[PDB]
Amino acid sequence: NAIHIGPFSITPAARGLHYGGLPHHQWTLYYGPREMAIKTLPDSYTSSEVRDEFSDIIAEFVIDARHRYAPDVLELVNSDGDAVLARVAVSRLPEALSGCIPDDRFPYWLLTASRPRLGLPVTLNEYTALAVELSAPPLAWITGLLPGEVLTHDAEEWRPPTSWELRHVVGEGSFTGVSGAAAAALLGMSATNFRKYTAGDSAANRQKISFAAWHYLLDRLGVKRAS
Amino acid sequence: VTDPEALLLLPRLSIQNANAISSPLTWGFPSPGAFTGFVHALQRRVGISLDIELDGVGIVCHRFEAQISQPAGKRTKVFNLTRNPLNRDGSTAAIVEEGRAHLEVSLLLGVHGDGLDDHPAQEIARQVQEQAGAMRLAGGSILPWCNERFPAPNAELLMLGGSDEQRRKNQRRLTRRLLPGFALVSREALLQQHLETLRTTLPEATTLDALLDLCRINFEPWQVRDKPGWLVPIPAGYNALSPLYLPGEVRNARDRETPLRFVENLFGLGEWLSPHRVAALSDLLWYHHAEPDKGLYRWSTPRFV
Amino acid sequence: QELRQFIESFIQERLQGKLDKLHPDEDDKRQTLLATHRREAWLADAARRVGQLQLVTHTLKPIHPDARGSNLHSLPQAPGQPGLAGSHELGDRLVSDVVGNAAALDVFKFLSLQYQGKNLLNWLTEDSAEAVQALSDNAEQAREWRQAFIGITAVKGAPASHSLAKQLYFPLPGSGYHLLAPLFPTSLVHHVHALLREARFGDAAKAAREARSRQESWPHGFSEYPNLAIQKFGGTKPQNISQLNSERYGENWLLPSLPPHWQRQDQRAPIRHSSVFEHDFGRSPEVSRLTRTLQRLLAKTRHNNFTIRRYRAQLVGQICDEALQYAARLRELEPGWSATPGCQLHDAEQLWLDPLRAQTDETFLQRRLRGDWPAEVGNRFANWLNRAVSSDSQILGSPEAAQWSQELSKELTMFKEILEDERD
DNA sequence: GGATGGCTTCC
DNA sequence: GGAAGCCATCC
């Protein structure tokens, strides 16, 4: 019997062995089609023990994925160049930047955090406009694990996600950590009609989600801003 | 409470099968009460036959080795036992648990009596070494000479002889032969200080010595706040549980000519430190002083700070 | 009142549980007779069992199971010397454990369960009318039960010890000795075993664990204990100490009390050029932890500058003492001084920081190393330490960083003086 | 696995 | 008789 923790799966190996006189079994931890770890555990283990045998590897993978796909940071500096006044984490670049060094001609500059800086001079009202427009949700790093073609705004290239992609955000094992019931209440549906979406295969009574419901759900969970 | 005249150094003492537990709470190094009783029994051996009284001990613990193992599924450790012989009918013994270990220590002994007056000092050190080489420390029998013939001789050092700079020179050249071991003190003052800084939170006493020596991980304001020294808990001694009882009035004693009392262990916190951090080497002698009007039975090293 | 009816219902439930192990031959009539005798005279059968049991806080059987002596229930007074650990520290939350017969332990557990609900746990001595009205015991049966409960609450022991206790000596000031028999505390270790279980297990503990996995910092603490040792009491059945040993399953966790370097690992003293370069850094486990703590303590403020300066001075002194101790352990741990092939700067440091000139070393090189002590090795070590500590212009521009540089210079001067006194 | 005994159960 | 011994059963 498998165990499912979000997009991860833990399966046994169908024929045990005797190590030290006691019967054991090999277990494998998968992330989609990629095998990550293998352990040998005895029997008389409940599923919670098999869970927290691998919990640390799960947490480390979460830490690395969070650090790698972190969004970019802009900052607001005065006319000298140092003494950053405020920071903001954006999800896109404001498209007018070109490599700059601040001088005394203007009292406010908006630079990047990367080292060969790009920058722009602002006047504290357009800065608020850019902060409103280009900001990033708190869980924007989950978008680094998604295929992109399920994330576009254009309706012509979009395709509905599969169940394995959909388990990245919904379910108690997912990275947002939200339930199916709470996500169903977030869309104004029943729990059963929402469970219809996450069956596993469309032949076994499963429907695709809509474009609008998918983007609105990504909006309400704080993953994609979806203006 | 009294300053000795000369300092005696026991060079390199290697023990096997010393008792590891020595406490109802701890299992590491044995209590210094074993050392104080050891030099008391040594004074009862040949100390009174040479017009010498002995007062205090210094310990450095050159190396350590405990016969312990890890049971492959957790982070605790189980002790290693031995096989007792068979029972009366030949079935099986009853299992009691005990911890064995191997030590390397050196002893620093203070001398109050007529050191250089009656005899030369080196013959005194040689004969007390020859006497001490037939005893045991904490159940651990003393190993004899092994092929290190180099730490065979002892040394006697009058502490206050000569000039002040001469005192610094002889204490430094005695410290030079005491490099790899770590001396151990009492730390009741820092314990009282952290009591009063923790009494600002709440008035508890044993939770102090619980909390002061664990890996305490504070939340992010993932920090681990730290103590400056190597603070290790230690049994301070005993507190009474019964009145003073007559030498005959209690059944099944060792000897019926000695008063008797029931006791419970008292605990404290020590610290392991390098000998080069202290300047006065006479600050390092453990003294068991009894207070029989109450229950306070106490070994410590005073005049250390 | 209702407590005696609850005791009768518990006796009927025990009779039904004794009828659950029913035999098809003759178990029904024997079970009916036992249930009738129980529902008749449970209190009369339990008085003789409650006469056999005694409440105790210190026990002699954990010292050895074959010995038998005086077991004492007593809370001694707080000593005069402040800052200690004993049973006197807590009085409100005690839990006494009893030694006796197993059916007597069942009777005592029934008496304690009847002691709950109402105030019977403290009112088992002072109660006649409601207790005799509830339990179905008469006035004479209630008086005999009160006498038996007052007797079971008493100690009822003779002062004697055994031959397998410890009973050690302790010398008196300028005079003889006393005999000192130690007793195993059980209430204290039950209390701290509960506290240690609560430390290692609990919703707050696992919540702080997943917090420190996710570094979400809500206001909460997190405790951790390393390298406990585990002891087992007696054979397979643990309850022969008490019922506290039954609920602790014969297990007591012991705290570590170890010397600092209790894992004697092999030394990488040998002549590697990159080995000599890394040994100039000297990356070790405790040294790496101290370097991480010193790097984390760099970004502090000056509002706690007294305590921050004290902690920085203590960390610097501990780092210097650990470096001197590691150098002494590497030197004395070295059996002989070998000519290192390509030990880049390792020979220049090990002219003084290495062992004496042996047969593998030249006598003229040994005389030259005795001619000049390694002051330049101390300068290189101070340079490597100052490179290990991350510095910036905030310390150069601030006065606290100047005071920290002065303290580091004083520590480096003390280390150079200690090296030059032994050197040469 | 220590504790207490109860009818046997020797000598 | 009394003790001791074994076995037994309790928890």
Are the C-beta atoms of residues C415 and C407 closer than 8 Å to each other? no
- Give the DSSP H or E segment for C147: helix C139-153
Determine the Cα–Cα distance for residues A80 and C340; give it in Å rounded to an integer. 54
Task: Render C14-29 in DSSP notation, one character per residue.
Answer: HHHHHHHS--TTTHHH
Are the C-beta atoms of residues B175 and B157 closer than 8 Å to each other? no
Could you check: is the Cβ of residue C1 within 7 Å of any atom of nucleic acid strand D? no
Distance C141 CA to D9 C1' (A): 39
Which of B180, B239, B254 is closest, CB to CB, to C329? B180
Q: How many residues does chain C have?
A: 424
Are the C-beta atoms of residues A81 and A102 closer than 8 Å to each other? yes
The dihedral region occupied by C206, where left means phi > 0, alpha psi between -120 and 50, and beta the remainder, is alpha
- Contact list in B for residue C172 (CB cut-off 8 A) is 290, 292
| Token representation of residue B161 | 């002889």
- Contact list in C for residue B92 (CB cut-off 8 A) is none
Alpha-carbon distance B246 to nearest alpha carbon in chain C (angstroms): 10
Determine the Cα–Cα distance for residues B235 and B184; give it in Å rounded to an integer. 13
Alpha-carbon distance C130 to nearest alpha carbon in chain B (angstroms): 39
Determine the Cα–Cα distance for residues A170 and A167; give it in Å rounded to an integer. 5
Please state the domain extents for chain B. Answer: 4-181, 182-301
| Token representation of residue C254 | 């012991």
Q: Is B27 on the interface with C (CB under 8 A)?
A: yes
Sole residue written with tokens 């283990």: A45
Determine the Cα–Cα distance for residues C389 and C387; give it in Å rounded to an integer. 5
From chain C residues 195-234, the ones with a CB under 8 A of any chain A CB are: 213-214
Distance B16 CA to D4 C1' (A): 44
Residue B69 backbone phi and psi in degrees, to 5? -145, 160
Stated in angstroms to one decimal place, the resolution of this structure is 3.2
Determine the Cα–Cα distance for residues C190 and C96; give it in Å rounded to an integer. 9
Sole residue written with tokens 């603070």: B231
Task: Render C235-249 in DSSP notation, one character per residue.
Answer: SS-GGGT-HHHHHTT
Residue of B nearest to C172 (CA): B290
Question: Is the Cα torsion angle B129, B131, B137, B142 positive or negative in sign?
Answer: positive
Are the C-beta atoms of residues C76 and C175 closer than 8 Å to each other? no
- Give residue numbers, 93 to 112 of C, with CB < 7 Å from strand D: 100-101
Determine the Cα–Cα distance for residues C410 and A139; give it in Å rounded to an integer. 50
CB atoms within 10 A of CB A67: 9
Could you check: is the Cβ of residue C237 within 7 Å of any atom of nucleic acid strand D? yes
Which positions of strand D lie within 7 Å of protein CB atoms? Answer: 1-4
From chain B residues 196-235, the ones with a CB under 8 A of any chain C CB are: 204-206, 208-210, 213-223, 226, 228-230, 232-234
> Which 3-state string (H, E, C) describes B59-88?
CCCCEEEECEECCCCCCCEEECCCCCCCCC
Which of C163, C315, C321 is closest, CB to CB, to B252? C163
Cβ <8 Å between C195 and B210: yes
Question: Is the Cα torsion angle C308, C313, C314, C320 positive or negative in sign?
Answer: positive
Cβ <8 Å between B214 and C224: yes
Are the C-beta atoms of residues A140 and A223 closer than 8 Å to each other? yes
What is each CA distance from A61 to A65, A66, B66, in whole angstroms?
A: 6, 8, 38
Question: Is the Cα torsion angle C5, C11, C16, C20 positive or negative in sign?
Answer: positive
The packing angle between helices B33-42 and B121-132, to 10°, is 120
Alpha-carbon distance C204 to nearest alpha carbon in chain A (angstroms): 17
Determine the Cα–Cα distance for residues B79 and B98; give it in Å rounded to an integer. 7
Could you check: is the Cβ of residue C65 within 7 Å of any atom of nucleic acid strand D? yes
Angle at B66 between CA B64 and CA B68, to 5 degrees: 155
Could you check: is the Cβ of residue B96 within 7 Å of any atom of nucleic acid strand D? no
Angle at B32 between CA B31 and CA B36, to 5 degrees: 135
Are the C-beta atoms of residues B281 and B108 closer than 8 Å to each other? yes
Cβ <8 Å between B63 and C264: yes
Nearest to B198 by CA among B225, B162, B169: B225
What are the start-end ranges of the E strands in C119-238?
168-171, 177-182, 184-185, 222-224, 229-232
Distance C104 CA to E9 C1' (A): 14
| Token representation of residue A86 | 């405020």
Are the C-beta atoms of residues B14 and B104 closer than 8 Å to each other? yes
Instruction: Report H helices in C215-304.
Output: 243-247, 273-281, 285-296
- Give the DSSP H or E segment for B14: strand B6-19
Nearest to C87 by CA among C211, C187, C177, C184: C187
Long-range contacts of residues B117-126, Cβ cutoff 8 Å, at least 24 apart: B118/B50, B118/B51, B119/B50, B121/B6, B121/B156, B121/B158, B122/B153, B122/B154, B122/B156, B124/B50, B124/B52, B124/B156, B125/B8, B125/B153, B125/B154, B125/B155, B125/B156, B126/B153, B126/B154
The dihedral region occupied by C117, where left means phi > 0, alpha psi between -120 and 50, and beta the remainder, is left
Method: cryo-EM
> Which 3-state string (H, E, C) describes A112-131?
ECCCCCCCCECCCCHHHHHH
Could you check: is the Cβ of residue C226 within 7 Å of any atom of nucleic acid strand D? no
Could you check: is the Cβ of residue C61 within 7 Å of any atom of nucleic acid strand D? yes
Find how far residue C271's CA is from the centre of its chain: 43
| Token representation of residue B120 | 């030369």
